[PDB]
Amino acid sequence: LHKEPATLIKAIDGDTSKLMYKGQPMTFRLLLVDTPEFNEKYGPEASAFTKKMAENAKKIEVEFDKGQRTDKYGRGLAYIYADGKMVNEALVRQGLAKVAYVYKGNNTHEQLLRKAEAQAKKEKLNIWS
Ligand SMILES: Cc1cn([C@H]2C[C@H](OP(=O)(O)O)[C@@H](COP(=O)(O)O)O2)c(=O)[nH]c1=O
Ligand SMILES: [Ca+2]
Numbered sequence: 001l002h003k004e005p006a007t008l009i010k011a012i013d014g015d016t017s018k019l020m021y022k023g024q025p026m027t028f029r030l031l032l033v034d035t036p037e038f039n040e041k042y043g044p045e046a047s048a049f050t051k052k053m054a055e056n057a058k059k060i061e062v063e064f065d066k067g068q069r070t071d072k073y074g075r076g077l078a079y080i081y082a083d084g085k086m087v088n089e090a091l092v093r094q095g096l097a098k099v100a101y102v103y104k105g106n107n108t109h110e111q112l113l114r115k116a117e118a119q120a121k122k123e124k125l126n127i128w129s
Helices: 043-056 087-093 110-122
Strands: 004-013 016-021 024-030 060-063 076-082
Touching: 004 024, 004 043, 016 060, 016 076, 024 087, 043 076, 043 087, 076 087, 087 110
Parallel strands: 024 076
Antiparallel strands: 004 016, 004 060, 016 024, 060 076
8 A cells, every 4th residue: 555645625524634635625534434423422533633633634645445435425434544653543542433344345544453452441441542
């Protein structure tokens, strides 16, 4: 997999953000994770965490997996990095997302994220509390 450039346009919620990619606006949905909706418990915390991580980053990068790059809603599906730190992983490690939506052929970082979820759960963090 390869990291490609993007810039933040606007935060949206815990697991979606609006980025400019190849000079086009796109909503990106983070691969392999599920955050609570804003209206749900920890939903506000997950939105805040993703907004802060993206807005503070000097460098945002998109990394597509091997399989589908856009979902049925036209959202880009990717791993998103902020100054080299994967936002998908960081949410799960903090207990602000669960590993979820693991489809065959877009699951390169599944085991990395499951390890982070196990550690968040052992710490009883947030969703696991
Ligand atoms: C994360 C992800 C979601 N989706 C679709 C599945 C779900 O369909 P439904 O909308 O029919 O439930 C929806 C979940 O996204 P959200 O969690 O953003 O709502 O996004 C994919 O198709 N591929 C993916 O990799
Ligand atoms: Ca969600």
